[PDB]
């Protein structure tokens, strides 16, 4: 019943008597699987989690410079040299300035000038490698039949509840058997390696903000970088050397690139961190479902004899199905809920179909709530639930260096 | 002699008027028949009384963020913070249903508000064409040793050097050059750079000269110059991002420092510096018409130097092929005319090439006095022969996206 309310909802109908049903589980998407003489199960990929990520390269986006010195040479006296050029913590640039009799040279021409400054990084971003094996897919199951409106959004106590179940799929464990109590069990044979190619993807971390970027883009970033776990390569990206009318050379740092990186990241898939593990809200997972051990809990129940009352007004979902929530005054439970659509109330010939297969009242106590989903025909019809004189009827009617987009 | 050593050096040969274009980092050597060689350079452009126009925020922070949501067909969502101009808000439509807290399935109204505050800002200033001052430096050839090429201290007392100040309200000047007479300067200050279409931008103690149309197109939150004290920011949405989260709340997050992005956008703009309240400029040209009428040759009446000369420095070739010669005079017959020339054959001493320094002279009546002259030699082998008679000195020479527009 967890798919009820989801706009990206897919209704799959497996072959009658057939064992397998192929499903595509997307994030923010939901699959309602239906089969003849089988209960309706709602299957959804809830979370994709990446573990044991390793540092590859770190880019500096905010830097600072200190201990800046210069060395100059007269024309034809060769290139200028500072002992700081042999220091890997320093950023240097050679230029040509006008030299002469007033400048301290016996020759007129362009003299070599070198300026060095000690580079230090204030704020940095980190790129992490993703191993395909250290990837976990969490699937949530929910069975139709019983359960009221309050169970559509409930993830506390699925271990004790037979109607709801949690499934964990990894490339090392791509198969699972989900115990559904009286409903039997659902088999899940999934393809985790063919969901989102993580060999060409990196995990980027900024000021507590995370993304999933293409590896080729990350290696093309125009910022100072250091390998894994520092010696900064391409320090020139955050350092500017200003030449002053061929007389002097000044060195100044280029401010925070945080904003420029944020705007470049527009197009990349956003992510979040769950301590050490990385949470993902994008990507699909192809699964083959085993219907073999899936059974109808309540097929032996007798029809509900007492009166029903609508707790909520029957509502149309985004896909045209009707959700009905009813209260049962009877104590003859567990019993089969009489539910159908009718165009003519004299014959009561059933029109349309039921999404909720075998709707049942489980409690033996009175005033118990229950929810069912119907697929009505196009045009006018009547949602007729219950039997005899006390039956309730409701009239219904249907109808640059920007990141590329992943 | 101030142009000696400058790579961007122009040699103009003028007649009463001589038209010159004075650029920053450039130098003009003006030469004329029966007139002294004058070196003219535009040293500083200064802008005064600049007024604030608009201030753009490049680093912001958000606080006190709240949300309000409504079920489908229950109308638009409202927060009391939407009526507060210190808050940035966005209305959206989210999926609502039986699991979300609604009895109806459809798009429900959701509103999110956050208190906007600016941490760091930049300021744009208007430039009035009248509040603009140009400073020109003059230096005459004839006397002066090597040490005078770079000297700006006592130009008031020195006849060879002079300071000229040109403004749109005073575009003309008469520069007293002592014995050399005077140089007239009729300049065009208003057609130097067109400051009516330019603004003065100030960041983290960094200054630029930007086009006014570009500055008004900046995608950043802005407040008017007149909005003193507590400021009202227009277009706060430029630094604030609204991400869709769920049916009851929508996440709001600030975009981070745009300082680096503004710096990279400013690549192309003319850089400037501040001198307290006045703005210093190191770019732009100034067109001047020079009056040669009152300019005279100090030393035309002097007799030729009879004593011996000594080279203080080795004659050096400038970037343009001219030779600079610095000599010491042992004689006391000064003031006298320095005998200077180039020769291919020492028997006849027929002068080859030409002199850049017109009428080289020794001014002091005392011995061991230093002096510097500039020569333009012919191509190939020649001799820098200075002095007269037996004591003359000879030296062998040889020639040859919101990017700023």
């Amino acid at each position, epitope marked *: 019943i967890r798919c009820i309310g989801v706009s990206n909802r897919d209704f799959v109908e497996g072959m009658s008597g057939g064992t397998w049903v192929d499903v595509v589980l997307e994030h923010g998407g939901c699959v309602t699987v239906m089969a003849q003489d089988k209960p309706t199960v709602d299957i959804e990929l809830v979370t994709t989690t990446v573990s044991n990520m390793a540092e590859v390269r770190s880019y500096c986006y905010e830097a600072s410079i200190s201990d800046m010195a210069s*060395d*100059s*040479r007269c024309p034809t006296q060769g290139e200028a040299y500072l002992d700081k050029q042999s220091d890997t913590q320093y950023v240097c640039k050679r230029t040509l300035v006008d030299r002469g009799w007033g*400048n*301290g040279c016996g020759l007129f021409g362009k003299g070599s000038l070198v300026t060095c400054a000690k580079f230090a990084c204030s704020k940095k971003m980190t790129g992490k490698s993703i191993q395909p094996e250290n990837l976990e897919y969490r699937i949530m199951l929910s069975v139709h039949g019983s359960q009221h409106s309050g169970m559509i959004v409930n993830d506390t106590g699925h271990e004790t509840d037979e109607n709801r179940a949690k499934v964990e799929i990894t490339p090392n464990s791509p198969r699972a058997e989900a115990t559904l109590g009286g409903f039997g069990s659902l088999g899940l044979d999934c393809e985790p390696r063919t969901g989102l190619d993580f060999s060409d993807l990196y995990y980027l971390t900024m000021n507590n903000k995370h993304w999933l970027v293409h590896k080729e883009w990350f290696h093309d970033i125009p910022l100072p970088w250091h390998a894994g776990a520092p010696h900064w390569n391409n320090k020139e990206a955050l350092v500017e050397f200003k030449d002053a009318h061929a007389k002097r050379q000044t060195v100044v740092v280029l401010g925070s690139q945080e904003g420029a990186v944020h705007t470049a990241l527009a197009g990349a898939l956003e992510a979040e961190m769950d301590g050490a593990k990385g949470r993902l809200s994008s990507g699909h997972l192809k699964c083959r479902l085993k219907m073999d051990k899936l059974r109808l809990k309540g097929v032996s129940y007798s029809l509900c004899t007492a009166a029903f009352t609508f707790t909520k007004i029957p509502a149309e979902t985004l896909h045209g199905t009707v959700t009905v929530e009813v209260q049962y005054a009877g104590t003859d439970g567990p019993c089969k809920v009489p539910a159908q659509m009718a165009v003519d109330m004299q014959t009561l010939t059933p029109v349309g179909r039921l999404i909720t297969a075998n709707p049942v009242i489980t409690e033996s106590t009175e005033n118990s709530k229950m929810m069912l989903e119907l697929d009505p025909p196009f045009g006018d019809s009547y949602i007729v639930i219950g039997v005899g004189e006390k039956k309730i009827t409701h009239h219904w009617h249907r109808s640059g260096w920007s990141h590329p987009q992943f | 002699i101030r142009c000696i050593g400058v790579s961007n050096r122009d040699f103009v040969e003028g007649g009463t008027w001589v038209d010159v274009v004075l650029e920053h980092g450039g130098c003009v050597t003006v030469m004329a028949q029966d007139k002294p060689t004058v070196d003219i350079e535009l040293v500083t452009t200064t802008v005064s009384n600049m007024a604030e126009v608009r201030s753009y925020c490049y680093e912001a922070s958000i606080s006190d963020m709240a949300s309000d949501s409504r079920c489908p067909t229950q109308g638009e969502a409202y927060l009391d913070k939407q009526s507060d101009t210190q808050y940035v808000c966005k209305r959206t439509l989210v999926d609502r249903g039986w699991g979300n807290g609604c009895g109806l399935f459809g798009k429900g109204s959701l509103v999110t508000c956050a208190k906007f505050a600016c941490s760091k800002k930049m300021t744009g200033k208007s430039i009035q064409p009248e509040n603009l001052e140009y400073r020109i430096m003059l230096s005459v050839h004839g006397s002066q040793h090597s040490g005078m*090429i*770079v000297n700006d201290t006592g130009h008031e007392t020195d006849e060879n050097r002079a300071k000229v100040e040109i403004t749109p309200n005073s575009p003309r000047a008469e520069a007293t050059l002592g014995g050399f007479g005077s140089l007239g300067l009729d300049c065009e200050p208003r057609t130097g750079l067109d400051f009516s279409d330019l603004y003065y931008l100030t960041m983290n103690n960094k200054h630029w000269l930007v086009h006014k149309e570009w500055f008004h197109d900046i995608p950043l939150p802005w407040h008017a110059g007149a909005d003193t004290g507590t400021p009202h920011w227009n277009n706060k949405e430029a630094l604030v991002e609204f991400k869709d989260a769920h049916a009851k709340r929508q996440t709001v997050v600030v975009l981070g420092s745009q300082e680096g992005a503004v710096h990279t956008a400013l690549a192309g703009a003319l850089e400037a510096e501040m001198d307290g309240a006045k703005g210093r400029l190191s770019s732009g040209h100034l067109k001047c018409r020079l009056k040669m009428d009152k300019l005279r040759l100090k030393g035309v009446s002097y007799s030729l130097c009879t004593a011996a000369f000594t080279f203080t420095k080795i004659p050096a070739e400038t970037l343009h092929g001219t030779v600079t010669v610095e000599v010491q005079y042992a004689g006391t017959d000064g003031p006298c005319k320095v005998p200077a020339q180039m020769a291919v054959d020492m028997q006849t001493l027929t002068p080859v090439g030409r002199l850049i320094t017109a009428n080289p002279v020794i001014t002091e009546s005392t011995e061991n006095s230093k002096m510097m002259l500039e020569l333009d030699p012919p191509f190939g082998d020649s001799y820098i022969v200075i002095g007269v008679g037996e004591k003359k000195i000879t030296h062998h020479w040889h020639r040859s996206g919101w990017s700023h527009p």
Partner: antibody, heavy 133, light 110 residues
Framework: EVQLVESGGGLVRPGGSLRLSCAAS????????MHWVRQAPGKGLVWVSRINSDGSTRNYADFVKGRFTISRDNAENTLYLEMNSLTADDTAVYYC??????????????????????????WGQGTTVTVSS | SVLTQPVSVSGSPGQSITISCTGTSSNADTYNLVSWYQQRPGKAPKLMIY???KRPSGVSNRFSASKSATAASLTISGLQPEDEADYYCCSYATSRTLVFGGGTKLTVVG
């Protein structure tokens, strides 16, 4: 005429700090390199530091392992030597010195050319600094 | 570069004396850039020679200097009692730093 007058010398405790000052007059101060030289009692002259016209180049002897900072105020015709973490090894007469020769070659006093022609032609009388507990 | 000088030199009035300045980790440029300083008892040092052999104006013509690729030397001709002083040579230790020799005490005897 041309003179250099040092100040700020006196008794300082071991590990202490001191700021020496030098007043220059009779020459174009802003265009000259300035040096500090010291002489321990009964010992030889020891070069300490030099500074160019704008202060973009400040050089130090090996024994001044970042403990001293040379500086200048051109409009005030003043030279300074900020000294920290002083030891008995630093007890000496400190002389303020002008490089008059470099001015003849580079009248700007800016360019820090390697091994340039120099001459310490003007010396102050020196100020005594004693690093005594 | 480290500069070494004799500890002391003796001379009689009217005679000539030569003070050597030799370097370790030095080169021809070290000696090309040698400057010499005279320090009379209780007086501040005075520049006598710069650029290895150049004598500043005002300095007596009795002072001359020579240099080779291995040493620099100061020569005082026609020795006078006023020449009694400590003499120091100076040159570059590195491209950016200077160093003085240990000094030579010149005694004028008799």
């Amino acid at each position: 005429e041309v003179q250099l007058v040092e100040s700020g010398g006196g008794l300082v405790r071991p590990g202490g700090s001191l700021r020496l000052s030098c007043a220059a007059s009779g020459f174009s101060y802003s265009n000259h390199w300035m040096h500090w030289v010291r002489q321990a009692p009964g010992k030889g002259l020891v070069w300490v530091s030099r500074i160019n016209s704008d202060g973009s180049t400040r050089n130090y002897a090996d024994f001044v392992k970042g403990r001293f900072t040379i500086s200048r105020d051109n409009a005030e015709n003043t030279l300074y030597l900020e000294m920290n973490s002083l030891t008995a090894d630093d007890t000496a007469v400190y002389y303020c010195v002008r490089d008059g020769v470099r001015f003849y070659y580079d009248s700007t006093g800016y360019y820090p050319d390697s091994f340039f022609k120099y001459g310490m032609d003007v010396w102050g009388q020196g100020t005594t600094v004693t690093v005594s507990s | 570069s480290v500069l070494t000088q004799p500890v002391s030199v003796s001379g009689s009035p009217g005679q000539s004396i030569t003070i050597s300045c030799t370097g370790t980790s030095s080169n021809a440029d070290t000696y090309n850039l040698v400057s010499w300083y005279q320090q009379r008892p209780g007086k501040a040092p005075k520049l006598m020679i710069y650029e290895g052999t150049k004598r500043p104006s005002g300095v007596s013509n009795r002072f001359s200097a020579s240099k080779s690729a291995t040493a620099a030397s100061l020569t005082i001709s026609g020795l006078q009692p006023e020449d009694e002083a400590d003499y120091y040579c100076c040159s570059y230790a590195t491209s950016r730093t200077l160093v003085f020799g240990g000094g030579t005490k010149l005694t004028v005897v008799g």
